[PDB]
């Protein structure tokens, strides 16, 4: 299924996340984006600080030549980093990624995250910014920009820019059964942006920036009992929660039955009753919470 954005273009609601860390040899991400694609993603989603352009690149032009796909069927993301959010950085930062890729166009290019960095905080006008993710629109470089890791006040601060010429087509933050966003999804959908939960299964639960001592998302008692009772298992439990809710959902997996297990989440639907089972688990949580956010002037869980 596909969504339409409010530019126009269409996205498709299930994705792919590439993210692994370091330890992971970078030949991973080529050959789980593979699998990825003929399991049936259509989303990829990526970024620059994923170190992993080039591999996902490659395995998108991989499935084209070999005749699975063509370009226009999929929709890859790119994002700008914030050591680059000085105007005249983000066209370059994102020639960069596409050259790396070698793509002609992403179909998403993202403000990765409101918090700048020296190009050790900087100070920028995300106005600015946006100004010139909209020049890469006009370009063709991207043929949809948007925005991740923006709370309300800074998404507001974009729509009611002076002069504003396109509007984010999202907003991708974390969001799951335990920090589900109720308030700022209504917003999104209150000015036709769609929200892209990452971490939605719970991440990664890397120890750069997650506690271990954090409840594990997929040991929920209560998305168990929803596995048991669909016959399905927690993960699927947790997409399909997203997409019954009109949120645009990203997994990532590098194990090749996880990746096929994932694209299951069409092939069955929760209940009203099983929807606010889900809900009643919200409880403010959010799994990235590290000094290194949580300092910054513009750290979004503020609000
Ligand atoms: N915009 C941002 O700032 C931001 C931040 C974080 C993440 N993201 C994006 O969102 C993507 C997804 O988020 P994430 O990486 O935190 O991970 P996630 O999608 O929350 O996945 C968490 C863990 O779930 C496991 N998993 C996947 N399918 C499963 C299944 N069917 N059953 C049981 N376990 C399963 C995976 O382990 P295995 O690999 O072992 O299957 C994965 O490591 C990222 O890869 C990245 O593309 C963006
Ligand atoms: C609250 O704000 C943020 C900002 C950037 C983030 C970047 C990542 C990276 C590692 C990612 O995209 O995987 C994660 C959490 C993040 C949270």
């Given at each position: 299924q596909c969504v339409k954005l409010n530019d126009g273009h269409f996205m498709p609601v299930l994705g792919f996340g590439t993210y692994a860390p370091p330890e992971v040899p970078r030949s991973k991400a080529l050959e789980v984006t593979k699998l990825a694609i003929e399991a049936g993603f259509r989303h990829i989603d990526s970024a620059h600080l994923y170190n992993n352009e080039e591999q996902v690149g490659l395995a998108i032009r991989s499935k084209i030549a070999d005749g699975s796909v063509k370009r226009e069927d999929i929709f890859y993301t790119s994002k700008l980093w914030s050591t680059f959010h000085r105007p005249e950085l983000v066209r370059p930062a994102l020639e960069n990624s596409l050259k790396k890729a070698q793509?002609?166009?992403?179909?998403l290019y993202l403000i990765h995250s409101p918090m700048s960095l020296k190009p050790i905080f900087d100070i920028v006008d995300l106005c600015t910014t946006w100004e010139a993710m909209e020049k890469c629109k006009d370009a063709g470089l991207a043929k949809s920009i948007g925005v991740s890791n923006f709370n309300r006040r800074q998404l507001e601060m974009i729509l009611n820019k002076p002069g504003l010429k396109y509007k984010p087509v999202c907003n991708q933050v974390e969001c799951h059964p335990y920090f589900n966003r109720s308030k700022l999804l209504d917003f999104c959908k209150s000015k036709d942006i769609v929200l892209v939960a990452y971490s939605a299964l719970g991440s990664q639960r890397d120890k750069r920036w997650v506690d271990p001592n954090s409840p594990v998302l997929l040991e929920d008692p209560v998305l168990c009992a929803l596995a048991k009772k669909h016959k399905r298992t927690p993960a699927l439990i947790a997409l399909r929660y997203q997409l019954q809710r009109g949120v645009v959902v990203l997994a990532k997996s590098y194990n090749e039955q996880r990746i096929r297990q994932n694209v299951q989440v069409f092939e069955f639907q929760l209940t009203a009753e099983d929807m606010k089972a889900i809900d009643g688990l919200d409880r403010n949580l959010h799994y990235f919470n590290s000094d290194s956010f949580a300092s910054h002037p513009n750290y979004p869980y503020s609000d």
């Open positions: 793509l002609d166009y992403v179909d």
